[PDB]
């Protein structure tokens, strides 16, 4: 054949730290369907937002938003443990159906995105060239995000542990922990991997008595 009807750009969803995760690759023939299992970003997260994106960039913010919906009622669990199956199905009319289902709770939500949605022909070409020009930067970004996400997880577990510790935690330690949490927060907004890892360390150094407390029966 000299003509194939295809989805012109990659389609996927936003995942923790502003990353596009692709479910259907650019230039896939239609009709087509693919599924991938995702999980929660934080301990005891009760809901997830499925932000649907079209484009080739690894930074979610530089792709085209097609829609979003939420799925709630996720039962309490450690982050990473719930199984949220997300399915993209593009039919022969180019209509995109996106669903998310939590395997433990059985709850599901879906949206339908009409075929005219997303980028036009001129924006499609610009997008492909944009991603080609930014391929190395986007590699660096994904590295930065793995470190940001560790940073983010430590900040949350530490805050949870301070709450649970309450007045068992000495006043000098809480002050030092508070400062170090704020510092980690600030670093996480920059693009410097070493700076994040550095504040993670500074937080750990003031956290020994806390770790001891969290650890006992």
């Amino acid at each position: 054949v000299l003509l194939l009807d295809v989805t012109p750009l990659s389609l996927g969803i936003e995942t923790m730290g502003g990353v596009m995760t692709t479910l259907i690759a650019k230039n896939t023939t239609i009709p087509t369907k693919h599924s991938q299992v995702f999980s929660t970003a934080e301990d005891n997260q009760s809901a997830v937002t499925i932000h649907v994106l079209q484009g080739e960039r690894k930074r979610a913010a530089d792709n085209k938003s097609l829609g979003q919906f939420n799925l709630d009622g996720i039962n309490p669990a450690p982050r990473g443990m719930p199984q949220i199956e997300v399915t993209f199905d593009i039919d022969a009319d180019g209509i995109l159906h996106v669903s998310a289902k939590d395997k433990n709770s059985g709850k599901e939500q879906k949206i339908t995105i009409k075929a005219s949605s997303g980028l036009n022909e001129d924006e499609i070409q610009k997008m492909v060239r944009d991603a080609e020009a930014n391929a190395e930067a986007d590699r660096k970004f994904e590295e930065l995000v793995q470190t940001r996400n560790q940073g983010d997880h430590l900040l949350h577990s530490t805050r949870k542990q301070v709450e649970e510790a309450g007045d068992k935690l000495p006043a000098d330690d809480k002050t030092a922990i508070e400062s170090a949490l704020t510092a980690l927060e600030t670093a996480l907004k920059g693009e410097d991997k070493a700076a994040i890892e550095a504040k993670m360390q500074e937080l750990a150094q003031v956290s020994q008595k806390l770790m001891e407390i969290a650890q006992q029966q």
Binding site: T15, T40, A41, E42, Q45, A47, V48, I84
Partner: peptide, 13 residues
């Protein structure tokens, strides 16, 4: 293994 999803945005602070 699985990639992680963000939570819905709460009301503005």
């Amino acid at each position: 293994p699985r990639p992680y999803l963000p939570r819905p945005r709460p009301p503005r602070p």
